Design an enzyme around this catalytic site. Structure first.
Site, PDB file in Angstrom:
ATOM      1  N   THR A  75       0.907  -1.336  -0.097  1.00  0.00           N
ATOM      2  CA  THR A  75       0.125   0.066   0.199  1.00  0.00           C
ATOM      3  C   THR A  75       0.813   1.473   0.165  1.00  0.00           C
ATOM      4  O   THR A  75       0.459   2.437  -0.772  1.00  0.00           O
ATOM      5  CB  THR A  75      -1.032  -0.095   1.230  1.00  0.00           C
ATOM      6  N   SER A  91       5.492  -7.322   1.891  1.00  0.00           N
ATOM      7  CA  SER A  91       5.136  -8.813   1.677  1.00  0.00           C
ATOM      8  C   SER A  91       5.085  -9.081   0.244  1.00  0.00           C
ATOM      9  O   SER A  91       4.829 -10.310   0.127  1.00  0.00           O
ATOM     10  CB  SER A  91       3.864  -9.375   2.749  1.00  0.00           C
ATOM     11  N   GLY A 151       3.563 -15.648  -2.468  1.00  0.00           N
ATOM     12  CA  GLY A 151       3.561 -16.720  -3.640  1.00  0.00           C
ATOM     13  C   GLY A 151       3.109 -16.004  -4.882  1.00  0.00           C
ATOM     14  O   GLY A 151       3.038 -16.722  -5.975  1.00  0.00           O
ATOM     15  N   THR A 160      -0.054 -15.100  -5.779  1.00  0.00           N
ATOM     16  CA  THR A 160      -1.438 -15.343  -6.423  1.00  0.00           C
ATOM     17  C   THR A 160      -2.211 -14.169  -6.646  1.00  0.00           C
ATOM     18  O   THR A 160      -2.206 -13.179  -5.679  1.00  0.00           O
ATOM     19  CB  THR A 160      -2.023 -16.297  -5.725  1.00  0.00           C
ATOM     20  N   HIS A 176      -2.471 -13.114   6.211  1.00  0.00           N
ATOM     21  CA  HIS A 176      -3.457 -12.398   5.715  1.00  0.00           C
ATOM     22  C   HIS A 176      -4.035 -11.637   6.663  1.00  0.00           C
ATOM     23  O   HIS A 176      -5.150 -11.375   6.517  1.00  0.00           O
ATOM     24  CB  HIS A 176      -4.530 -13.295   4.838  1.00  0.00           C
ATOM     25  N   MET A 212      -3.831  -8.963  -2.643  1.00  0.00           N
ATOM     26  CA  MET A 212      -3.138  -8.016  -3.543  1.00  0.00           C
ATOM     27  C   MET A 212      -4.053  -7.068  -4.464  1.00  0.00           C
ATOM     28  O   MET A 212      -3.774  -5.851  -4.524  1.00  0.00           O
ATOM     29  CB  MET A 212      -1.997  -8.818  -4.229  1.00  0.00           C
TER      30      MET A 212
HETATM   31  C1  LIG Z   1       4.165 -15.258   3.458  1.00  0.00           C
HETATM   32  C2  LIG Z   1       3.079 -14.390   2.549  1.00  0.00           C
HETATM   33  C3  LIG Z   1       2.227 -15.031   1.930  1.00  0.00           C
HETATM   34  C4  LIG Z   1       1.331 -13.981   1.144  1.00  0.00           C
HETATM   35  N1  LIG Z   1       0.654 -14.822   0.003  1.00  0.00           N
HETATM   36  C5  LIG Z   1      -0.153 -13.937  -0.661  1.00  0.00           C
HETATM   37  C6  LIG Z   1      -0.392 -14.343  -2.204  1.00  0.00           C
HETATM   38  O1  LIG Z   1      -0.114 -15.390  -2.600  1.00  0.00           O
HETATM   39  N2  LIG Z   1      -1.215 -13.155  -2.723  1.00  0.00           N
HETATM   40  C7  LIG Z   1      -1.812 -12.382  -2.210  1.00  0.00           C
HETATM   41  O2  LIG Z   1      -2.649 -11.432  -2.950  1.00  0.00           O
HETATM   42  N3  LIG Z   1      -1.247 -11.604  -1.069  1.00  0.00           N
HETATM   43  C8  LIG Z   1      -0.515 -12.400  -0.195  1.00  0.00           C
HETATM   44  N4  LIG Z   1      -0.210 -11.919   0.859  1.00  0.00           N
HETATM   45  C9  LIG Z   1      -0.523 -11.063   1.514  1.00  0.00           C
HETATM   46  C10 LIG Z   1      -0.068  -9.663   0.841  1.00  0.00           C
HETATM   47  O3  LIG Z   1       1.375  -9.749   0.482  1.00  0.00           O
HETATM   48  C11 LIG Z   1      -0.345  -8.551   1.835  1.00  0.00           C
HETATM   49  O4  LIG Z   1      -1.550  -8.697   2.349  1.00  0.00           O
HETATM   50  C12 LIG Z   1       0.217  -7.158   1.580  1.00  0.00           C
HETATM   51  O5  LIG Z   1       1.601  -7.086   1.339  1.00  0.00           O
HETATM   52  C13 LIG Z   1      -0.038  -6.300   2.795  1.00  0.00           C
HETATM   53  O6  LIG Z   1       0.355  -4.910   2.180  1.00  0.00           O
HETATM   54  P1  LIG Z   1       0.504  -3.615   3.524  1.00  0.00           P
HETATM   55  O7  LIG Z   1       0.749  -2.410   2.772  1.00  0.00           O
HETATM   56  O8  LIG Z   1      -0.545  -3.611   4.223  1.00  0.00           O
HETATM   57  O9  LIG Z   1       1.772  -4.149   3.988  1.00  0.00           O
HETATM   58  P2  LIG Z   1       3.246  -4.883   3.849  1.00  0.00           P
HETATM   59  O10 LIG Z   1       3.395  -5.262   2.482  1.00  0.00           O
HETATM   60  O11 LIG Z   1       3.632  -5.790   5.057  1.00  0.00           O
HETATM   61  O12 LIG Z   1       4.109  -3.765   4.100  1.00  0.00           O
HETATM   62  C14 LIG Z   1       4.316  -3.075   5.628  1.00  0.00           C
HETATM   63  C15 LIG Z   1       5.715  -2.411   5.337  1.00  0.00           C
HETATM   64  O13 LIG Z   1       6.010  -1.792   6.521  1.00  0.00           O
HETATM   65  C16 LIG Z   1       7.437  -1.964   6.635  1.00  0.00           C
HETATM   66  N5  LIG Z   1       7.400  -1.854   7.973  1.00  0.00           N
HETATM   67  C17 LIG Z   1       7.128  -2.682   9.283  1.00  0.00           C
HETATM   68  N6  LIG Z   1       7.316  -2.015  10.409  1.00  0.00           N
HETATM   69  C18 LIG Z   1       7.842  -0.841   9.953  1.00  0.00           C
HETATM   70  C19 LIG Z   1       8.028   0.403  10.753  1.00  0.00           C
HETATM   71  N7  LIG Z   1       7.979   0.365  12.069  1.00  0.00           N
HETATM   72  N8  LIG Z   1       8.367   1.434  10.046  1.00  0.00           N
HETATM   73  C20 LIG Z   1       8.650   1.413   8.925  1.00  0.00           C
HETATM   74  N9  LIG Z   1       8.146   0.460   8.233  1.00  0.00           N
HETATM   75  C21 LIG Z   1       7.831  -0.555   8.591  1.00  0.00           C
HETATM   76  C22 LIG Z   1       7.453  -3.346   6.420  1.00  0.00           C
HETATM   77  O14 LIG Z   1       8.831  -3.839   6.419  1.00  0.00           O
HETATM   78  C23 LIG Z   1       6.740  -3.378   5.008  1.00  0.00           C
HETATM   79  O15 LIG Z   1       7.443  -3.326   3.827  1.00  0.00           O
HETATM   80  C24 LIG Z   1       1.034 -12.716   1.738  1.00  0.00           C
HETATM   81  C25 LIG Z   1       1.648 -12.494   2.536  1.00  0.00           C
HETATM   82  C26 LIG Z   1       2.754 -13.125   3.499  1.00  0.00           C
HETATM   83  C27 LIG Z   1       3.663 -12.426   4.229  1.00  0.00           C
END
Ligand SMILES: Cc1cc2nc3c(=O)[nH]c(=O)nc-3n(C[C@H](O)[C@H](O)[C@H](O)COP(=O)(O)OP(=O)(O)OC[C@H]3O[C@@H](n4cnc5c(N)ncnc54)[C@H](O)[C@@H]3O)c2cc1C
Ligand SMILES: *[C@@H]1O[C@H](CO)[C@@H](O[C@@H]2O[C@H](CO)[C@@H](O[C@@H]3O[C@H](CO)[C@@H](O)[C@H](O[C@H]4O[C@H](CO)[C@@H](O)[C@H](O)[C@@H]4O[C@H]4O[C@H](CO)[C@@H](O)[C@H](O)[C@@H]4O)[C@@H]3O)[C@H](O)[C@H]2NC(C)=O)[C@H](O)[C@H]1NC(C)=O
Ligand SMILES: *[C@@H]1O[C@H](CO)[C@@H](O)[C@H](O)[C@H]1NC(C)=O
Ligand SMILES: *[C@@H]1O[C@H](CO)[C@@H](O)[C@H](O)[C@H]1NC(C)=O
Ligand SMILES: *[C@@H]1O[C@H](CO)[C@@H](O)[C@H](O)[C@H]1NC(C)=O
Ligand SMILES: *[C@@H]1O[C@H](CO)[C@@H](O)[C@H](O)[C@H]1NC(C)=O
Length: 581
Positions: A28, A101, A106, A108, A514, A559
């Site tokens: 995001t 993440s 993976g 998908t 998730h 995603m």
């Molecule tokens: C192992 C695994 C499998 C998954 N499988 C799938 C799949 O196959 N298909 C699918 O659609 N989605 C999948 N997902 C879920 C999808 O990747 C996530 O739902 C999505 O990336 C979440 O986005 P986000 O912006 O919430 O956070 P994230 O992408 O998690 O990003 C949060 C960011 O904050 C950084 N961060 C953390 N704490 C701090 C802090 N204090 N300060 C600054 N930066 C910080 C993190 O390091 C990261 O880069 C998977 C997740 C994981 C972990």
């Protein structure tokens, strides 16, 4: 290239003012960063704990290497509390780096059932958060590639109408260059045999039956991690700044007005090695659902009862950290004959009745009569604070199951040499929480409790879905490839009944990583934390833009909607910016 543009020096940003500070460079956060800086007058600073990793090598670039990075430094690996279901600690895999993440998933790519997103507007009163709107943005973030002859031949179906081809997220069929396994189609015959659809395009809004799907990868098979998609093409943008290796500890709140206003943020790596950066317009929290809520709690935004014993002054009392929804995953693995060799992944999105089979009746009595009891139980355990609001969410799920017959389970098949099923109940009724356990943000002392299987429907639901996966592995057309169950194998009797599975499961499951909901986009009356524009209630200039906000789980891989979601909020922000003049 990009690596030289990233700041690694805390002093390069301390004391500076930018329009927006985005805490977290993940799916995001980078999508927003790139959306806002499209307007050259808008200066953004992304502060990420990790660093650049998209070009590191196959551990990141090859989706086929999925899982090898777990435990390295690109894995935050948050450990849960000692779970009550099994008295064990689980590890929540979570990308640590630019792309968050998306760096470790993976890949998908699928979408939810449209009734689900629709409920964000009708049930949760989130004006504008409906399928039409959300699917619109989703198609806008997508750069889908149609499957070739070989891919269709293997079992791929692509409804063009359901996909954007002008977007940014490169998505297409994974193809290791090897032949696809006959097992994908064999699974399609086994389900077809019991009347389940197949080859339905999962990006269309009805994820049902067994289908293959696209993956976020370029045609060359390199991971379409968020940093590669939105940051790499745009890192040269002078209004885009990204500080790496630092932790956002908390939001700075000025309290000399009618409403606290988010003024900037504090970052560092240790108590006593912190720096403050400021925002002219707003602080956008995008640290993921396990952390955006703690950033708020460290900041005085959260429940007085948590904050107070920790010595934190509560500025805004909100149910931050409550309503965590994560799924449980169980594996069923079966050896195959050489005939089934090849690459391929498919998923059966099974509805309630397909998951439960013969138990549909029973399963149904439960849904119908335990809603309130369950609601009081989850509230008692700290997963939520208002039984009625919780009830409404349950009623919403009963509705989706009972009247929209959305998919309840996901049976993900991995072949490439084995028939491996990763199964998860997609709609958990359990509610967990996430609360800080200390006032110092850099101590990283928090309690993450997803409360897996503390709701009986979830346990039975997961037991039935996994049992289903054992059943199809050896049904119909599948039978010709089956060469002995490997896992559970000898750990669980082959002829195991639903109860046996129920007992086994709490000890042979992993979180699905998730987690959504810890800063729920719902009206404040309903237990919400953020409004239909992702703005925290009662604070000016503070938004939560990540997986913390969806109020519900979704029958899909997130995603697609998370990119849709970041795009829609970015628009919201653009409008507020042009207003804030
Ligand atoms: C192992 C695994 C499998 C998954 N499988 C799938 C799949 O196959 N298909 C699918 O659609 N989605 C999948 N997902 C879920 C999808 O990747 C996530 O739902 C999505 O990336 C979440 O986005 P986000 O912006 O919430 O956070 P994230 O992408 O998690 O990003 C949060 C960011 O904050 C950084 N961060 C953390 N704490 C701090 C802090 N204090 N300060 C600054 N930066 C910080 C993190 O390091 C990261 O880069 C998977 C997740 C994981 C972990
Ligand atoms: C996660 O860990 C927690 C603990 O950290 C587990 O919770 C504890 O679980 C134990 C049982 O597993 C429980 O201890 C029992 O407390 C009862 C009080 O309500 C006692 O009556 C009971 O004693 C009987 O059983 C003991 C063990 O066999 C005997 O030593 C004892 O003398 C008693 O025996 C009488 O009763 C039994 C059966 O009823 C019978 O077989 C005997 O002949 C005799 O009549 C235990 O002491 C703890 O109270 C639990 N809670 C806490 C806080 O400790 C939790 O279950 C774990 N979860 C998982 C999934 O494993
Ligand atoms: C493609 O998807 C849309 C769903 O909105 C549908 O109207 C269209 O006819 C689909 N075609 C097929 C063959 O699935
Ligand atoms: C994608 O963009 C190109 C060029 O700017 C245009 O020709 C094409 O019609 C676009 N596709 C859609 C369907 O928006
Ligand atoms: C599911 O089974 C229940 C009864 O067990 C029935 O009421 C419902 O009509 C079934 N089918 C669907 C598609 O929901
Ligand atoms: C509990 O939730 C209900 C349903 O949303 C809401 O009407 C009520 O105001 C809530 N109670 C409190 C004390 O917030």
């Amino acid at each position: 290239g990009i690596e030289a543009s990233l700041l690694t020096d805390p002093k390069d940003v301390s004391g500076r003012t930018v329009d927006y500070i985005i805490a977290g460079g993940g799916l995001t956060g980078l999508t927003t960063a790139a959306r806002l800086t499209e307007n050259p007058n808008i200066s953004v600073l992304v502060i990420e704990s990790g660093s650049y990793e998209s070009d590191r090598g196959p551990i990141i670039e090859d989706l086929n290497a999925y899982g090898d990075i777990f435990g390295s430094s690109v894995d935050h690996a948050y450990e849960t509390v000692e779970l009550a279901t099994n008295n064990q600690t689980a590890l929540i895999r979570s990308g640590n780096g630019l792309g968050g993440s998306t760096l470790v998933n993976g890949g998908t790519w699928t979408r939810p059932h449209k009734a689900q997103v629709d409920s964000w507007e009708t049930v949760f009163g989130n004006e504008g958060w409906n399928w039409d709107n959300v699917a619109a943005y989703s198609l806008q973030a997508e750069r889908a590639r149609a499957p070739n002859a070989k891919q269709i031949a293997a079992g791929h179906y692509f409804n063009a109408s359901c996909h954007g081809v002008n977007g940014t997220v490169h998505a297409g069929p994974r193809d290791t260059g090897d032949d696809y396994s006959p097992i994908v189609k064999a699974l399609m015959s086994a389900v077809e045999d019991r009347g389940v659809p197949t080859k339905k395009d999962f990006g269309c809004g009805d994820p049902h039956g067994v289908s293959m799907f696209p993956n976020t990868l370029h045609e060359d098979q390199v991971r379409s991690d968020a940093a590669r998609e939105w940051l790499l093409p745009n890192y040269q943008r002078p209004n885009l700044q990204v500080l790496t290796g630092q932790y956002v500890g908390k939001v700075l709140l000025s309290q000399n007005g009618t409403t606290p206003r988010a003024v900037g943020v504090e970052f560092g790596t240790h108590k006593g090695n912190t720096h403050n950066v400021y925002a002219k317009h707003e602080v956008l929290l995008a640290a993921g659902s396990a952390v955006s809520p703690t950033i708020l709690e460290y900041s005085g935004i959260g429940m007085k009862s948590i904050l107070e014993p920790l010595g934190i002054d509560t500025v805004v009392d909100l149910p931050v950290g409550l309503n965590l929804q994560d799924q449980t995953t169980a594996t069923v693995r079966s050896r195959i004959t050489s005939a089934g060799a090849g690459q391929g992944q498919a998923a059966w999105f099974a509805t309630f009745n397909e998951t439960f089979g013969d138990y549909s009746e029973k399963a149904h009595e439960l849904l119908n009569t335990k809603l309130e009891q369950w609601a009081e139980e989850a509230v008692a355990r700290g997963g939520f604070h208002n039984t009625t609001a919780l009830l409404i969410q349950y009623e919403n799920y009963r509705d989706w199951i009972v009247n929209h017959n959305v998919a309840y389970s996901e049976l993900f098949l991995d072949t490439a040499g084995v028939a491996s099923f990763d199964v998860w109940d997609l709609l958990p009724f359990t509610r967990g929480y996430v609360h800080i356990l200390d006032k110092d943000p850099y101590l990283h002392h928090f309690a993450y409790d997803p409360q897996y299987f503390l709701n009986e429907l979830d346990l039975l639901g997961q037991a039935a879905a996994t049992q289903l996966a054992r059943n199809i592995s050896n049904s119909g057309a599948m039978q010709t490839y089956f060469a002995g169950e490997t896992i559970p194998g000898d750990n669980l009797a082959y002829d195991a009944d639903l109860s046996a599975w129920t007992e086994y499961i709490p000890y042979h499951f992993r979180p699905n990583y998730h987690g959504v909901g810890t800063c729920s986009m719902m009206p404040k009356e309903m237990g919400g934390v953020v409004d239909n524009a992702a703005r925290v209630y009662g604070v000016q200039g503070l938004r939560v833009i990540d997986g913390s906000i969806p109020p519900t789980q979704m029958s899909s891989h997130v995603m697609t909607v998370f990119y849709a979601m970041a795009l829609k909020i970015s628009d919201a922000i653009l409008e507020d910016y042009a207003s804030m003049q």
